Tab-separated table of C-alpha atoms in Angstrom:
chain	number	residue	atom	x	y	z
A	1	UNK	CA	74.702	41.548	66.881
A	2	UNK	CA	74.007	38.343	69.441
A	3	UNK	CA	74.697	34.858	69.652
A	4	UNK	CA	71.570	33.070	68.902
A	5	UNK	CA	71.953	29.312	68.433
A	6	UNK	CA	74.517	26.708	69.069
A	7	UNK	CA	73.931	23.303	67.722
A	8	UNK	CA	76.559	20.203	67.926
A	9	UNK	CA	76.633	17.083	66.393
A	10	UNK	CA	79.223	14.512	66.855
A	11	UNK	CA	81.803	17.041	68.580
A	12	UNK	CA	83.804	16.039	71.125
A	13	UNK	CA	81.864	14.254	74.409
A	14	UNK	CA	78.322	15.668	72.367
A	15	UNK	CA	77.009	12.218	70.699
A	16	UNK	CA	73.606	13.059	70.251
A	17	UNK	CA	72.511	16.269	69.023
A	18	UNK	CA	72.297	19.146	71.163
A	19	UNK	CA	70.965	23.174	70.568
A	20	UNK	CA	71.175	25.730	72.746
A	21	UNK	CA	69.831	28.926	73.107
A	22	UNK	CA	71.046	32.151	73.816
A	23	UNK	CA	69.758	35.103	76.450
A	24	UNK	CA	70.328	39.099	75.072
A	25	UNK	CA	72.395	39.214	78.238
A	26	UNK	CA	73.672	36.709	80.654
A	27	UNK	CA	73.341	32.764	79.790
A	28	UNK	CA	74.705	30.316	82.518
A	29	UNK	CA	76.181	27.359	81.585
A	30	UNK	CA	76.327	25.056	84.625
A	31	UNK	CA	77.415	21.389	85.461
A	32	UNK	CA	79.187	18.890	87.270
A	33	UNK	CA	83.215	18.201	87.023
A	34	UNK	CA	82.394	15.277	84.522
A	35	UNK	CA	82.021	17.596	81.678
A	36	UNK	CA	84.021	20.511	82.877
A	37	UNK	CA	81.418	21.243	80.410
A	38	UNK	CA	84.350	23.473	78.068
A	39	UNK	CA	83.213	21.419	75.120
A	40	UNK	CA	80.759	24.209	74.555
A	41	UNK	CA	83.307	27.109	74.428
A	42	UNK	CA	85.577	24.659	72.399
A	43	UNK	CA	82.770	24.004	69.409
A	44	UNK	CA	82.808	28.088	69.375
A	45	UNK	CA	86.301	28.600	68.757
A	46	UNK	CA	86.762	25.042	66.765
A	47	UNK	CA	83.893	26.458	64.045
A	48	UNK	CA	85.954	29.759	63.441
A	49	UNK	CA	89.988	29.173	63.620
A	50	UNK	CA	91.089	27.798	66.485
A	61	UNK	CA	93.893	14.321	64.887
A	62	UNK	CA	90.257	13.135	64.423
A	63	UNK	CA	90.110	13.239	68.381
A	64	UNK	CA	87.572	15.600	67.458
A	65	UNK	CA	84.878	13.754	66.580
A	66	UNK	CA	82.778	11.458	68.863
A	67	UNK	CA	83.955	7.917	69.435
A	68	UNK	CA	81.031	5.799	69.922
A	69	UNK	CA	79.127	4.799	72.754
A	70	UNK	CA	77.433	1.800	74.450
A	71	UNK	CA	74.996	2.339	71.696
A	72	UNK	CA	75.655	5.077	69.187
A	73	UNK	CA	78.270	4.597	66.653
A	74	UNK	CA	81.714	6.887	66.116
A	75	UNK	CA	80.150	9.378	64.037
A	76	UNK	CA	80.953	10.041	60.593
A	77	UNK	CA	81.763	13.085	61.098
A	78	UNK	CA	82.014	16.354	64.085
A	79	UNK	CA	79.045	19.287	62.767
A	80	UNK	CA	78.904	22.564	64.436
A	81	UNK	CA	76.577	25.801	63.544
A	82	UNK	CA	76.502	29.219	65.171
A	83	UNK	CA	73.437	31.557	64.318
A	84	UNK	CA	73.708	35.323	65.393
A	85	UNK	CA	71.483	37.983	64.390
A	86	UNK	CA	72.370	41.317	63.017
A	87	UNK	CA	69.479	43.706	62.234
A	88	UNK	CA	66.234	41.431	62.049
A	89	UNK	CA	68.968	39.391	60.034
A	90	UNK	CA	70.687	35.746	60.641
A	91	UNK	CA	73.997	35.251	59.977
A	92	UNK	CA	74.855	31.315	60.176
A	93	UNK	CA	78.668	30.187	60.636
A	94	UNK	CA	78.976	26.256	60.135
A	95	UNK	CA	82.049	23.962	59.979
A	96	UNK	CA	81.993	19.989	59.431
A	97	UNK	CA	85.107	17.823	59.226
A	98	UNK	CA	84.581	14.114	58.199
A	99	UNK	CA	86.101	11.257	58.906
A	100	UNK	CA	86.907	10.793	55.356
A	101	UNK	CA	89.437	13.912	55.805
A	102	UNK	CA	86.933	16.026	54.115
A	103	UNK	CA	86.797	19.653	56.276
A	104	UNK	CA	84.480	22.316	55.282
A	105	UNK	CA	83.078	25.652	56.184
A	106	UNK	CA	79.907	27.646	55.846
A	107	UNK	CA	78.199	30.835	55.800
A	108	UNK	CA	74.697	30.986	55.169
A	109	UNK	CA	74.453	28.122	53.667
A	110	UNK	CA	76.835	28.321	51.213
A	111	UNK	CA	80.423	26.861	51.326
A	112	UNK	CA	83.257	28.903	51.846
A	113	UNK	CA	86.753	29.398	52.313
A	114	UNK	CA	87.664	30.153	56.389
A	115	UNK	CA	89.022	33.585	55.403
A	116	UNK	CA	85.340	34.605	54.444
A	117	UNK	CA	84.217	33.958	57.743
A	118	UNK	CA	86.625	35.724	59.746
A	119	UNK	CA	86.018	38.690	57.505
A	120	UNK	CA	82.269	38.569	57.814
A	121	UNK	CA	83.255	38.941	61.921
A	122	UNK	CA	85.551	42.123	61.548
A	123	UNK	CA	85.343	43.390	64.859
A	124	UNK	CA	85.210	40.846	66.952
A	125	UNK	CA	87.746	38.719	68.469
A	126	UNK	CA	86.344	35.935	66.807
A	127	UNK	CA	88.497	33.763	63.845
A	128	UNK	CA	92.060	35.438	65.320
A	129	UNK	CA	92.832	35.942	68.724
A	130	UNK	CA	89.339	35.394	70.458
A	131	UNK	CA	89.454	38.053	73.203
A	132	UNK	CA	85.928	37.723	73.767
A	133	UNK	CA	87.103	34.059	75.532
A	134	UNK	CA	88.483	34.599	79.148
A	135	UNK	CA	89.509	32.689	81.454
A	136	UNK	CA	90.680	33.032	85.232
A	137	UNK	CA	94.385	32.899	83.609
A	138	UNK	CA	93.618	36.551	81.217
A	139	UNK	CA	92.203	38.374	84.139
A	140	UNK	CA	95.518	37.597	85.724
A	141	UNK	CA	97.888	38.296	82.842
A	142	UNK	CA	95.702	41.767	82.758
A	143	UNK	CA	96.258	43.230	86.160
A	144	UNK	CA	99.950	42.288	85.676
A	145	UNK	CA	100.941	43.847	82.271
A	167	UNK	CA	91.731	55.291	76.208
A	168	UNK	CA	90.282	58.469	78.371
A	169	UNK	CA	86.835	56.323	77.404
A	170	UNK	CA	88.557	53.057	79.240
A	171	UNK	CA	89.950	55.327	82.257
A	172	UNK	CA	86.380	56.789	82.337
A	173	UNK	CA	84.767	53.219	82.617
A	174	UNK	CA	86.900	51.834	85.128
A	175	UNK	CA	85.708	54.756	87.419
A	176	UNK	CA	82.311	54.113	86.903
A	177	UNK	CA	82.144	50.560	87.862
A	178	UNK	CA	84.860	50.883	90.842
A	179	UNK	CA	82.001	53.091	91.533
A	180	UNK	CA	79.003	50.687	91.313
A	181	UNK	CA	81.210	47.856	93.113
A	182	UNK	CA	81.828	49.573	96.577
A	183	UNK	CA	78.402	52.374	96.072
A	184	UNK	CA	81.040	55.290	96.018
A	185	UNK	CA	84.856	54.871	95.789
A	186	UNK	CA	86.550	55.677	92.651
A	187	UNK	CA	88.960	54.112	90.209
A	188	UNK	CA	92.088	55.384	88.659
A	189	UNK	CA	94.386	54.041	85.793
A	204	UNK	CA	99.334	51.005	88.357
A	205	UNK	CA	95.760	50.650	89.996
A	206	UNK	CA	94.123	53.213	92.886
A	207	UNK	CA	91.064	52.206	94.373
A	208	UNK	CA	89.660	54.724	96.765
A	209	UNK	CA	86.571	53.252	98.666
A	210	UNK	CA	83.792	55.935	100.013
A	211	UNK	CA	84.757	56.328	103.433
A	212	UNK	CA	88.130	56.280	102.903
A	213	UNK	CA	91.012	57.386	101.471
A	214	UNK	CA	93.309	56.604	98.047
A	215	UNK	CA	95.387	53.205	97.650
A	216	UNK	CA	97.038	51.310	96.168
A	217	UNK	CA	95.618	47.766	94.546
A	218	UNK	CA	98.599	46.582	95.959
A	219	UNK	CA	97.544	46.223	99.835
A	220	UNK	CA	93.929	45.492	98.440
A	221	UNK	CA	92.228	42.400	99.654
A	222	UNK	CA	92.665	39.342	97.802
A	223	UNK	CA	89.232	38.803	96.926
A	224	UNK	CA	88.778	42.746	96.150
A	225	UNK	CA	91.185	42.520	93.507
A	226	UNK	CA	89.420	39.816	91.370
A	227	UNK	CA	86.786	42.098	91.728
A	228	UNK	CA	88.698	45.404	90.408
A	229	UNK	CA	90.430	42.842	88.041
A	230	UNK	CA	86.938	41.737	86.106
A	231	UNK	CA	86.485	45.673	86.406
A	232	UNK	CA	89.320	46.132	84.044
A	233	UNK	CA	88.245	43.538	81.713
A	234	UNK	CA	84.865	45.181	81.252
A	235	UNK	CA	86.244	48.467	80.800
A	236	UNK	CA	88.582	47.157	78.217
A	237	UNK	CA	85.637	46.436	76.325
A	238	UNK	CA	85.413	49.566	75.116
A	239	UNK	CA	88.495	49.288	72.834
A	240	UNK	CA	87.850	45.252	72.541
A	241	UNK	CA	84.254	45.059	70.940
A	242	UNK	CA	82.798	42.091	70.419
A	243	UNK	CA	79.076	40.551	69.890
A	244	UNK	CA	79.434	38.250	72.995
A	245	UNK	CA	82.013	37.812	76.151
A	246	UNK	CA	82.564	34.399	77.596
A	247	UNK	CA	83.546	34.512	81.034
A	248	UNK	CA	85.051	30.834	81.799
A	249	UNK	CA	84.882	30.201	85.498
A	250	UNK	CA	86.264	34.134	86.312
A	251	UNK	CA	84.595	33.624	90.224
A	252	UNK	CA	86.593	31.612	92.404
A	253	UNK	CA	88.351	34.131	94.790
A	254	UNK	CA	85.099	35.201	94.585
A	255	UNK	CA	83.312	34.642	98.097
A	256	UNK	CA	79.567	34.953	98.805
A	257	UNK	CA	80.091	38.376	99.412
A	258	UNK	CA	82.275	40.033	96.721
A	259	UNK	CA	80.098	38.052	94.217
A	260	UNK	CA	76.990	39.728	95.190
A	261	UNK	CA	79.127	42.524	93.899
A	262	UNK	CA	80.077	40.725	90.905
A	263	UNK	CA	76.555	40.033	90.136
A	264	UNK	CA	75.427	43.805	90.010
A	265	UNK	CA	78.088	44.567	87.736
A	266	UNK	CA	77.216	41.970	85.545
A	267	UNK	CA	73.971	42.958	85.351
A	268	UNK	CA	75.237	46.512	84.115
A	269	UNK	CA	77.071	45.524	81.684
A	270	UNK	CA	74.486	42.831	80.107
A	271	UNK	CA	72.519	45.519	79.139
A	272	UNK	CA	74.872	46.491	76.345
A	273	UNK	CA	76.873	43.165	75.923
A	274	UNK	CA	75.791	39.411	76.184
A	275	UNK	CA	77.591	36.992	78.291
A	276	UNK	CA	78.208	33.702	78.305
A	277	UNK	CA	79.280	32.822	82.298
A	278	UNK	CA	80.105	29.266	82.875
A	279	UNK	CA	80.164	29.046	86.642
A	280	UNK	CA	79.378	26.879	89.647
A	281	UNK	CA	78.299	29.553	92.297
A	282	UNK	CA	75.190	29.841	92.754
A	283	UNK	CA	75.157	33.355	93.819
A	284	UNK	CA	76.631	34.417	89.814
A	285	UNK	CA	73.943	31.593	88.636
A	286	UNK	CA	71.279	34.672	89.464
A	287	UNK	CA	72.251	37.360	87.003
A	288	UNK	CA	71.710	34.360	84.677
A	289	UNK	CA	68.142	34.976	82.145
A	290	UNK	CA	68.692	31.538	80.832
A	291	UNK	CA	70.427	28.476	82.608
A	292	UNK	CA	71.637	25.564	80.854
A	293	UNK	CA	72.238	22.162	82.837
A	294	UNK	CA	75.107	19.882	81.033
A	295	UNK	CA	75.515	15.912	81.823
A	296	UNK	CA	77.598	13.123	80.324
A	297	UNK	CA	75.696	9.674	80.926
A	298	UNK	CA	78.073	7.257	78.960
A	299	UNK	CA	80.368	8.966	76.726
A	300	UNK	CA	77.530	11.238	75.829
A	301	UNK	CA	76.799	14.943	77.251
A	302	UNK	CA	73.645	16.866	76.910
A	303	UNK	CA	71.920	20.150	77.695
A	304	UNK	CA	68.486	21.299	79.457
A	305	UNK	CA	67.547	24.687	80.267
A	306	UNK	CA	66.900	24.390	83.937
A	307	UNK	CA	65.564	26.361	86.760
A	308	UNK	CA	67.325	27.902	89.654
């Protein structure tokens, strides 16, 4: 199952209204500071579970709109499942599946396995990866493997050893700092195997990251986009690369919007 389709509508800084599509594997979404362009991962989590401050205000020529409208379209097996949520002005919320209202508990059941509607541990942020280095045989297994595939030889074990070709075992401790964001998002994806989910949003997971530990980063992602879509919101433009589609968000007034562009 993938994310196909996002389309807003009077959420948030999105006036106008916007649809996005989705790459199999990794989409970049990309933009300057003025929309810290979260507003995107927040319409996600808003449509599922997670005081009218959430509808748009108005603008130098667009009124406040009636109302905030989201709509997610994934895509099972040669199927479309659509999730859709719109809360009016009036007071009036209301969900939908498939065009058909419904109560929110429907939805979250329809998305069993998934983060999605509870806790959302597909979402994470620079603040998880932290919490996760700090705090089964097939999780072990895949931490090897891309330990592996980040240095072209070490190995991995699970406290954290890292043992790079060359060398010999140690300790994540006396790593370097950038090295262990790099074992870090290691974790994450091997977690994955016990934490399915249709899509992974990786929320701005590169900054220790320098140009060349995210070279690294960037052939791991590419691994693991071959079984799992991400969603990467990032401004370095060496992670920008393992991007299949990029998407380009600006706020003119009070007003954002979104273009596929080219790198």
């Amino acid at each position: 199952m993938r994310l196909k389709k996002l389309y807003l509508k009077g959420f948030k800084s999105f006036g106008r209204p916007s649809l996005i599509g989705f790459s199999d594997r990794v989409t970049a979404i990309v933009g300057p500071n003025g929309s810290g362009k979260s507003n995107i991962i927040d319409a996600i989590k808003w449509v599922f579970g997670e005081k009218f401050d959430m509808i748009f205000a108005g603008s130098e020529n667009l009124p406040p709109a009636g109302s905030a409208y989201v709509e997610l379209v994934f895509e099972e097996n040669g199927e479309e499942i659509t999730v859709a949520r719109e809360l009016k002005r009036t007071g009036e919320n209301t969900y939908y599946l498939n065009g058909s209202p419904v109560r929110l508990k429907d939805i979250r059941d329809r998305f069993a396995g998934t983060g999605l509607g509870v806790d959302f541990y597909s979402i994470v942020g620079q603040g998880q990866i932290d919490r996760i280095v700090n705090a089964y045989q097939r999780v072990n297994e895949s931490f090897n493997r891309f330990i592996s595939l980040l240095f072209f030889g070490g190995e991995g074990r699970l406290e954290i050893s890292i043992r790079k070709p060359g060398r010999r075992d140690q300790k994540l401790s006396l790593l370097s700092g950038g090295e262990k964001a790099l074992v870090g998002l290691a974790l994450l994806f091997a977690l994955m195997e016990i934490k399915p989910s249709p899509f992974y949003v990786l929320d701005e997971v590169d900054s220790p990251l320098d140009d060349y530990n995210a070279e690294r980063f960037k052939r791991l992602l590419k691994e693991n986009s071959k079984h799992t879509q991400f969603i990467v919101i990032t401004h370095n433009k060496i992670v920008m690369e393992a991007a299949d589609l990029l998407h380009g968000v600006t706020m003119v007034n009070g007003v954002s919007a979104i273009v596929p562009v080219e790198v």
